[PDB]
Write an enzyme that holds these catalytic residues in place. Structure first.
Site, short mmCIF file in Angstrom:
data_model
loop_
_atom_site.label_atom_id
_atom_site.label_comp_id
_atom_site.label_asym_id
_atom_site.label_seq_id
_atom_site.Cartn_x
_atom_site.Cartn_y
_atom_site.Cartn_z
N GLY A 99 -2.71 -6.08 0.43
CA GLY A 99 -1.32 -5.89 0.01
C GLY A 99 -0.96 -4.46 -0.37
CB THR A 100 2.36 -2.83 -1.01
OG1 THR A 100 2.94 -3.65 -2.03
CG2 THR A 100 2.89 -3.25 0.35
CB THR A 101 -0.34 0.73 -4.07
OG1 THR A 101 -1.09 1.06 -2.89
CG2 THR A 101 -1.12 1.16 -5.31
#
Ligand SMILES: *[C@@](C)(CO)[C@](*)(O)[C@H](Cc1ccccc1)NC(=O)[C@H](Cc1ccc(OC)cc1)NC(=O)[C@H](C)NC(=O)CN1CCOCC1
Lengths: 250, 240, 231, 244, 195, 243, 212, 235
Positions: free
Chosen positions: F29-31
């Site tokens: 996933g994204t940060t």
């Protein structure tokens, strides 16, 4: 979520065996030796207190348990399974008998109720059988003294004397030579200690041996006086000191 | 509750559990139904590997659902009791609300619906049973013979057989049964039924059961000697 | 492979294959396009038939006077989800006398689809939805995927060959966003968008399905001779 | 989910057999033999205890023969624990019938219901069947003396003489040989013991490895008496027929 | 509803049951049969709350008929009466009890004896030589105490029954429009058409 | 083997492979990050701009629980939403019974026990999200990070997603260089920088910055989104530092 | 209400009034108290208007479902028993219904069943139901013969409702006539008591209690 | 094994796809929609000559304005028909009107996907639902176990479906009379049927606004069969 295991985990194999019951019996075989001997005026049940660590206090762990004032139980196999069975056995004696008839159940019927509980673990959904064999010694007015063995299948058999667990095969042979129908309670305790020494390896004293009797009524252990018909529990756990006294004249 | 979908489709579009239930029916003892001009006859095989039986008390192969309808079957015996019980309860329930006994078609339709429900309900397997349901509707003299099967399909038959070696006796009935002229009497109908079973059975002793149903709740089961007379008569005409 | 038997199982790389297979059912579905300005939102859907004797599967469903969607994938699942939306829109009206915000509509669909991906026995929804609506914060367009992921967009497209329309809208973004107070032109842009996803077939009178909602326009669907204007 | 571990106890084989029922019958075939013989003036129940130990308490023991009511008894072959579940049900069912109709339950009705319970475990619930076969010996005023047997499939049948458990094939051939319809109880007692003595896997048939019972009209005038034989009584009847 | 009588004689049981069905100030019917045949040799008459009576009678009838078909056997009058009593004994502690009183007349074919049972809505069963429910009993019991003999014939029983109906027609406040009489014996159930 | 096919099954190591597999979905996933400050907490997340067609500022990922707690997560976004919905139910029932708003440590265990519960049965799947959350209560500021296994701890700084290692390194510098503490307005600017620095591990698609914060002085103890002038000021601070 | 239906040589006559009341308030004078279940079945309504109206149209739906399932028109007995078993389930709850299920079938012939809300179900040749049932009985019983002609039977049914409509304060409005034959029911018109009374009084010479 | 509601890698429900194979094994059913009415015809397909063919009930009435023909595991259709009939009658009870043919079909199709781990498996039968209402006139619907329904001008289902459908593609036009449609169903049934077509092994039915849903007699169908054979020989 929820128990989705509504199906039997114990099923018949092509050969006719019930695998889990057989395997539970294997777990009992691994368990520490316990035994029972029936005398004319009493019953003795005994076992070795296998300590898990010397730092552990083996007095806090009771392998021999009172079920009713006149019935005791000992086991071989998985301790935790035994513990919960004792809890359920004590309760069923009340719910399905004492709360109905105002008296404690006879040995054979309490045994029957415990057997029922163990049978249901063999057939009910999402459970394994209990990994223990019980030896239930008890007394009641109309049947006198009796000794029963309850297996993981839920089968139970009455015995004059027997042993279960680690060195049961040798212990049973030992008991066959010594047992007669004229044994007094003290003679049975003596034989029990002899039979148990064969299976025990390390220390053999009152602190490593657990032993109880179903014998005469104990008014001193009743806790109260004034009712003549109430005469006290026939179940009594022998003290560490009481065992050592008999080990000198062994 | 046990929820498992036991009856399910396979890649080729078959419900194997339903089809394996048909194999149980194929294993079961032969049963035959033949309807005449004024009667229906239900014939049933009884396997003779069982001697020392008590025929007084042993469950009979043909069961009365009501006083005017009967039910024979092929397949699992224990399963058949459940269908018979349900059918008998529905029979009384119909008399209670409609104030008229069930038609043979209605009773059949109910039993077939029960069988169907067990093919798409969770936690249950299909009934390993096919039934022959025969009788006469209330105030009607037209004979009725129906068949059901584990899948739940049902249909009317001039004559039909189910169970082991049923394909042999069906072959017999297919050439020996004339649609234009069904067995005009009771005797003719029983004889054709016994004949058809004698293609498959073995001995005509205590292997064949015959039950005759006539209009207006007139049902009677034949005894050994009565059936044996048909067996004796058929064999003498055969030697020709 | 071994981790696609049910939705409750993760793969070793952290994938839910049953959800991905449900996503695959959308890619097989017929193309549908969504786009909006500041005043109106428009759905355009290519309908599909079994053969020349059959009707054309209806793609667009109304949820409320101010909201509705188009579908691509399993139509029965779209019926279940649309029905759920109809109830949620309706609950908001009866209880709060409040038109359901298009954003909340998306949040509700996300949470409904999600529950089906974390429990044993169930399955993911096998359909993708494009929700358009006009509420108190103007025109909206949402994209629903049965993984649970809902996304607010100026324009988009889902179904087979949806990449053609999605590229076109990505180029036309600056043009169609400022088609304010003009329904017919916003539809024309949507009809031109869906045309980028056509192969061998062209838009006919019983093939094209258009819906619109806006400032002074209730959610209304156009089929048959009513869409002949735009071919 | 849990599907992975489901044995599916209530399904058909490709041949149209119920796996679990077949395997339960295989289990029962290793249990101690039990024999029922129906005479014109009574019924005999005889059963062999499973390999006994000398320290087993024989007199206060019950393994094979159980009492359902005053008129009906059963011989067991299979898992004892399973049997006791069914016996308590059968005992209750009899009392329900008596409470409802003020008449002792007809033998077949009791047998049917117990068999219907077994049937249920083979068609639904996903549980293992009861690994038990019964021989029902009983009396009622409709059919008189009756023998039935039921098995894990839930199928039951009536008999003049029958065996369950181990060596039924050999036992049934011997019963079929010497049985006749005008037989008396004391003759049936002798037949039952002779059959077990020949079919036994043990070296010699003794009193301590047997359970025995009779259901006679040998009470006083038009009433039935159940006799569950004591150890000493089995010892005597074994000497009286000349087996020991 | 209202009047139901029963007389057990030597070889039969005779049940008389009023024909009137009244509601408010209107006799709606004067040919009502307040009885159901439970089995070929067992008859049950009934009286009590409207609706409840027939609903209960037909429910019992269905159960007994179901038993007959299942076992291919007729339950004894004693067995049927015990079944009926238990149903009423359950009923009385229900949310809405059946308010139905019944008489069960039957011929036991195994004993070759007629049997008459009286059961009220509470589930109170008694076997009797003669029985009645409701206000009828207040006249007929004392009458039968005097005129009844245990060894009477069916014809004598009918004359004894005529004596009851006459007394009721004389002293009862309500017009019950005569009775339907039925006889239960070894040959089953039959109705006397001219009474 | 086959120990990884079913949830709640122990491998011979003593591991639940299904949970470790869920962690892989989180790593994908994204940060997202969390920074604890003097009198509050600051949350920030990377929003990948998949297409020009995405409406800016209108796919909000940070979620509020009650009025004083903020939650952000990386991994399966729907799973995160399910967890917040539970969190809101847990917080509502706490306030209903006890009157006071749910304390952050109390709230952290409510999510913790719920996520842990999804590792106890094979009929449910573990959560495919690591959740960074926190806020201000009576005892001051708290920052937490919760993982698929149900494991959570208090943090000075927290980071999860594809650029977690880049963000962690940057967080550790702030803890070392500011032992006395970081101010709320500073932490907002730093959060922007760290998301921009952590974006290097996801640099194909360009992104949209989203920040929120709770602070006893700046937001009066309530959760608020950083928007407008304060957001652009933070974006500019971050833009200056990458160059 | 006053409703009647009687059996005779030429089939069944069914007659009802058309008044609805809420206490002493005359709520309506034009109510339909006969519901046509199918071309061979009729239901009459007396008691609570909603109870009658709701459950008898519900009964019609059950009868339709029977002939769909059984490929045969429902019997008058079975139709009446559906309704009686329904109201018996609601026994005690407070339903108020007095109904008559009238119709012809092949197996039964012309048949009438009285069904009411306390669970009474009765087959019979003559019934009158409602607040004015007694007034209808008075005229109907004293003029009834089995051998009445279709013309005479229709009039007697009409005249019996008129009798009750006059005396009973809670009956009136108009008379709705029906005749049930082997071929089904036949409607014989709505007859306003406003005109019918004076027409009957004059022609018949009856109603001498009233000021002419 | 595997879940009942499991998706394949291509994005289809295994069980729904397998039930479609069961329907291909079923007997042929054909429906044609005209402006004068909708015709429904089925292959009876008796498994044995002793079976009384008039007891084979594969065409069924749902309401006076809606009929239904089936194909596949026909035992599964009973509860679908029961539901349809109840839905139709219930709607008439609630709204004092006939229910729309589409609404009826939609209600039946709602049962379809109510299976899983509700019933244990999908239906193994496809339905042709033909009817008339005031709004959309004469309509023919094909209802599948997927929960999906298409309206059709003409449609064939069962074992001879793909061959019959290609034939219906050529023959159908928007100006067919009822009599022309009747013959067309008989013609196409005779082509795809195994055994020779007659009045005993094939059944016709129609729904018209005026007379409602009617199953034809064996005498009436026999004359249409004779009329059909004569017309094919006539050129
Ligand atoms: C005559 C007129 C005597 O009332 C009839 O019984 C007539 C029958 C009838 C049938 C169908 C359609 C209309 C009329 N009954 C009535 O008109 C009826 C009388 C009645 C009132 C109340 C009752 O309480 C149980 C029973 C009977 N009138 C009504 O039902 C009026 C129109 N409605 C109400 O009183 C509303 N009430 C009904 C009971 O519940 C509370 C609300």
């Amino acid at each position: 979520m929820t128990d989705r295991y509504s199906f039997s985990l114990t099923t018949f194999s092509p050969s006719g065996k019930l695998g889990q019951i057989d395997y539970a019996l294997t777990a009992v075989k691994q368990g520490v030796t316990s035994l029972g001997i029936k005398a004319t005026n009493g019953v003795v049940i005994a076992t070795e207190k296998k300590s898990s660590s010397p730092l552990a206090m083996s007095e806090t762990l009771s392998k021999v348990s009172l079920l009713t004032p006149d019935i005791g139980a000992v086991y071989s196999g998985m301790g935790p399974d035994y513990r919960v069975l004792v809890d359920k056995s004590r309760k069923v004696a009340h719910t399905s008998y004492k709360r109905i008839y105002g008296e404690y159940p006879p040995t054979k019927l309490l045994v029957s109720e415990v057997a029922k509980i163990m049978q249901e673990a063999t057939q009910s959904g999402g459970v394994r059988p209990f990994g223990v064999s019980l030896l239930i010694a008890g007394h009641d007015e109309f049947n006198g003294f009796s000794l029963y063995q309850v297996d993981p299948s839920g089968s139970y058999f009455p015995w004059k004397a027997t042993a279960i667990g680690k060195g049961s095969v040798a212990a049973k042979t030992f008991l066959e030579k010594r047992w007669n129908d004229e044994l007094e309670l003290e003679d049975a305790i003596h034989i029990a200690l002899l039979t148990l020494k064969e299976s025990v390896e390390g220390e053999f004293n009152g602190d490593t041996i657990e032993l109880a009797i179903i014998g005469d009524e104990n008014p001193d252990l009743l806790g109260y006086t004034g009712i003549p018909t109430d005469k006290g529990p026939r179940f009594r756990k022998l003290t560490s000191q009481e065992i050592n006294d008999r080990l000198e004249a062994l | 509750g046990y929820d498992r979908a036991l009856s399910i489709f396979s890649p080729d579009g078959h419900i194997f559990q339903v089809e394996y239930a048909l194999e149980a029916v194929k294993r079961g003892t032969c049963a035959v139904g033949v309807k005449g001009k004024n009667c229906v006859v239900l014939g049933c095989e009884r396997r003779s590997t069982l001697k020392l039986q008590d025929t007084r008390i042993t469950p009979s192969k043909v069961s009365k659902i009501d006083s005017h309808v009967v039910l024979s079957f092929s397949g699992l015996n224990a399963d058949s009791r459940i269908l018979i019980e349900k059918a008998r309860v529905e029979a009384q329930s119909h008399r209670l609300t409609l104030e008229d006994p069930v038609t043979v078609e209605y009773l059949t339709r109910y039993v077939a619906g029960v069988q169907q429900r067990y093919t798409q309900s969770g936690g249950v397997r299909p009934f390993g049973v096919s039934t022959l349901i025969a009788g006469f509707d209330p105030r009607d003299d037209e004979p009725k013979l129906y068949q059901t099967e584990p899948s739940g399909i049902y249909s009317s038959w001039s004559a039909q057989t189910i169970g082991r070696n049923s394909k042999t006796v069906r072959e017999f009935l297919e050439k020996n049964y004339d649609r234009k002229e069904p067995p005009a009497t009771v005797e003719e109908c029983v004889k054709l039924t016994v004949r058809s079973l004698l293609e498959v059975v073995q001995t005509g002793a205590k292997n064949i059961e015959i039950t005759v149903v006539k209009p207006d709740s007139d049902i009677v089961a034949l005894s050994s000697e009565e059936i044996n007379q048909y067996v004796t008569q058929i064999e003498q005409e055969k030697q020709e | 492979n071994n981790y696609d038997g049910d939705t409750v199982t993760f793969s070793p790389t952290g994938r839910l294959f049953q959800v991905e297979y449900a996503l695959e059912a959308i890619k097989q579905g017929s193309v549908t396009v969504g786009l909006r300005s500041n005043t109106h939102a428009v759905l355009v859907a290519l309908k599909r038939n079994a053969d020349e004797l059959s009707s054309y599967q209806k793609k667009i469903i109304k949820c409320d006077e101010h909201m509705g969607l188009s579908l691509a994938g399993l139509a029965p699942d779209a019926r279940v989800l649309s029905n759920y939306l109809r109830q949620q829109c309706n609950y908001s009206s009866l209880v709060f006398n409040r038109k359901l915000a298009v954003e909340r509509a998306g949040h509700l669909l996300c949470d409904k689809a999600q529950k089906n991906t974390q429990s044993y026995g169930g399955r993911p929804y096998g359909v993708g939805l494009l929700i358009i609506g006009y509420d108190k914060s103007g025109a909206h367009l949402l994209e629903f995927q049965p993984s649970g992921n809902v996304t607010e967009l100026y324009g988009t497209a889902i179904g087979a060959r949806s990449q053609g329309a999605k590229t076109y809208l990505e180029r036309t973004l600056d043009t169609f966003i400022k088609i304010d107070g003009n329904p017919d032109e916003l539809i024309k842009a949507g009809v031109e968008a869906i045309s980028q996803s056509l192969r061998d077939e062209s838009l006919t009178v019983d093939n094209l399905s258009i819906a619109i909602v806006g400032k002074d326009t209730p959610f209304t669907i156009y089929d048959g001779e009513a869409v002949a204007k735009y071919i | 989910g849990s599907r992975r571990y489901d044995s599916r106890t209530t399904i058909f084989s490709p041949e149209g057999r119920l796996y679990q029922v077949e395997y339960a019958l295989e289990s029962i075939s290793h249990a101690g033999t039990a024999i029922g013989i129906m005479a014109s003036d009574g019924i005999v129940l005889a059963a062999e205890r499973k390999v006994t130990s000398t320290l087993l308490e024989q007199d206060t023991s019950t393994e094979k023969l159980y009492k359902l009511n005053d008129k009906i008894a059963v011989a067991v072959a299979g898992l004892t624990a399973d049997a006791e579940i069914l016996i308590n049900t059968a005992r209750i069912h009899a009392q329900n019938y008596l409470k409802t109709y003020n008449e002792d339950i007809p033998v077949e009705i009791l047998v049917r219901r117990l068999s219907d319970i077994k049937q249920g475990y083979t068609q639904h619930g996903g549980l293992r069947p009861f690994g038990v076969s019964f021989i029902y010996a009983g009396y009622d005023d409709r059919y008189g003396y009756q023998l039935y047997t039921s098995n894990p499939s839930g199928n039951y049948t009536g008999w003049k003489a029958i065996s369950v458990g181990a060596n039924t094939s050999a036992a049934q051939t011997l019963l079929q040989m010497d049985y006749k319809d005008d037989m008396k109880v004391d003759d049936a007692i002798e037949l039952a013991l002779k059959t077990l003595s020949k079919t036994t896997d043990s070296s010699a048939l003794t009193y301590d490895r047997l359970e025995f019972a009779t259901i006679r009209k040998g009470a006083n005038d038009g009433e039935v008496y159940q006799k569950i034989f004591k150890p000493q009584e089995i010892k005597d009847i074994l000497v009286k027929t000349g087996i020991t | 509803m209202d009047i139901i009588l029963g007389i057990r004689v030597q070889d039969s049981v005779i049940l008389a049951s009023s024909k009137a069905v009244t509601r408010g100030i209107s006799v709606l019917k004067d040919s009502d049969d307040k009885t159901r045949q439970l089995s070929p040799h067992t008859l049950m008459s009934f009286a009590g709350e409207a609706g409840d009576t027939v609903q209960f009678a037909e429910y019992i009838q269905a159960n007994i008929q179901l038993y007959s078909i299942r076992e291919d056997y007729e339950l004894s009058p004693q067995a049927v009466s015990s079944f009926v009593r238990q149903e009423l004994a359950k009923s009385i502690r229900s949310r809405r009890p059946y308010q139905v009183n019944v008489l069960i007349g039957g011929y036991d074919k195994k004993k070759n004896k007629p049997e008459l049972y009286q059961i009220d809505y509470l589930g109170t069963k008694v076997e009797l030589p003669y029985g009645a429910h409701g206000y009828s009993g207040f006249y007929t019991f004392s009458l039968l105490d005097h005129h009844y003999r245990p060894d009477m014939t069916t014809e004598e029983g009918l004359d004894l029954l005529k004596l009851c109906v006459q007394e009721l027609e004389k002293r009862m406040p309500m017009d019950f429009k005569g009775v339907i009489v039925k006889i239960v014996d070894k040959d089953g159930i039959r109705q006397v058409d001219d009474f | 083997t086959g120990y990884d096919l079913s949830n709640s099954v122990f491998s011979p190591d003593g591991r639940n492979f299904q949970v470790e597999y869920a962690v892989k979905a989180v790593e994908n996933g994204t940060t997202s990050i969390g920074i604890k400050c003097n009198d509050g907490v600051v949350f920030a997340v990377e929003k990948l701009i998949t297409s020009k067609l995405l409406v800016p500022q209108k796919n909000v990922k940070i979620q509020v629980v009650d009025r004083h707690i903020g939650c952000v997560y990386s991994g399966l976004i729907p799973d995160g939403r399910h967890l917040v919905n539970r969190g809101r139910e847990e917080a509502a029932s706490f306030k209903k019974l006890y009157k006071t708003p749910i304390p952050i440590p109390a709230f952290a265990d409510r999510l913790g026990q719920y996520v842990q519960a999804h590792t106890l049965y094979n009929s449910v799947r573990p959560f495919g999200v690591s959740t960074i959350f926190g806020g201000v209560d009576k005892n001051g500021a708290h920052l937490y990070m919760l993982e698929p296994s149900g494991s959570y701890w208090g943090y000075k700084g927290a980071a999860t997603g594809k650029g977690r290692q880049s963000a962690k390194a940057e967080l550790e510098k702030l803890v070392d260089h500011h032992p006395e503490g970081l101010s709320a307005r500073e932490a907002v600017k730093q959060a922007a920088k760290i998301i921009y620095l952590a974006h290097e591990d996801n640099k194909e698609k360009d992104f949209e910055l989203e920040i929120s914060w709770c602070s006893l002085s700046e937001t009066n103890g309530l959760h608020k989104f950083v928007k407008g002038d304060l957001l652009q000021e933070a974006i500019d601070f971050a833009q200056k530092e990458i160059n | 209400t006053t409703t009647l239906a009687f059996r005779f040589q030429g089939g069944i006559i069914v007659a009802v009034d058309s008044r609805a009341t809420a206490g002493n308030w005359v709520a309506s004078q034009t109510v339909k108290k006969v519901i046509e279940i199918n071309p061979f079945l009729l239901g009459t309504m007396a008691g609570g208007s909603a109870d009658c109206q709701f459950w008898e149209t519900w009964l019609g739906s059950q009868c339709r479902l029977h002939e769909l399932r059984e490929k045969e028109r429902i019997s008058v007995a079975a139709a009446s028993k559906i309704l009686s078993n329904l109201v018996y389930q609601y026994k005690g709850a407070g339903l108020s219904m007095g109904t008559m299920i009238c119709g012809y079938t092949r197996k039964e012939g012309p048949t009438i069943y009285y069904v009411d809300s306390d669970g009474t179900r009765l087959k019979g040749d003559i019934f009158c139901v409602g607040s004015g049932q007694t007034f209808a009985y008075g005229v109907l019983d004293s003029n009834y013969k089995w051998d009445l002609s279709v013309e005479d039977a229709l009039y007697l049914g009409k005249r019996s409702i008129l009798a009750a409509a006059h005396r009973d304060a809670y009956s009136g409005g108009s008379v709705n006539l029906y005749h049930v034959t082997e071929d089904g029911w036949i409607y014989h018109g709505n007859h306003d008591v406003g005109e019918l009374f004076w027409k009957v009084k004059e022609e018949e010479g009856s109603f001498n209690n009233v000021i002419g | 094994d595997r879940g009942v509601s499991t998706f394949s890698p291509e994005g289809r429900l295994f069980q729904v796809e397998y039930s479609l194979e069961a329907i291909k094994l079923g007997s042929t059913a054909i429906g044609i929609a005209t402006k004068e009415g909708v015709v429904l015809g089925v292959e009876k397909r008796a498994t044995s000559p002793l079976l009384e063919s008039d007891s084979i009930e594969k065409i069924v009435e749902i309401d006076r304005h809606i009929g239904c023909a089936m194909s596949g595991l026909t035992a599964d259709a009973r509860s679908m028909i029961e539901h349809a009939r109840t839905a139709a009658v219930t709607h008439n009870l609630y709204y004092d009107e006939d229910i729309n043919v589409e609404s009826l079909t939609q209600s039946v199709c709602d049962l379809a996907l109510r299976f899983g781990e509700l019933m244990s498996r999908p239906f193994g039968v496809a339905l042709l639902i033909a009817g008339h209402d005031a709004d959309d006139g004469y309509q023919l619907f094909h209802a599948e176990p997927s929960g999906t329904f298409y309206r059709y001008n003409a449609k064939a289902i069962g074992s001879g479906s793909e061959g019959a459908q290609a034939e219906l593609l050529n023959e159908w036009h928007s100006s067919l009379t009822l009599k022309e449609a009747e013959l067309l169903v008989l013609k196409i049934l005779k082509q795809v049927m195994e055994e020779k077509l007659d009045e005993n092994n094939a059944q016709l039915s129609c729904i018209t606004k005026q007379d409602g849903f009617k199953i034809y007699d064996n005498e009436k169908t026999a004359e249409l069969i004779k009329e059909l054979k004569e017309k094919e020989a006539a050129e």
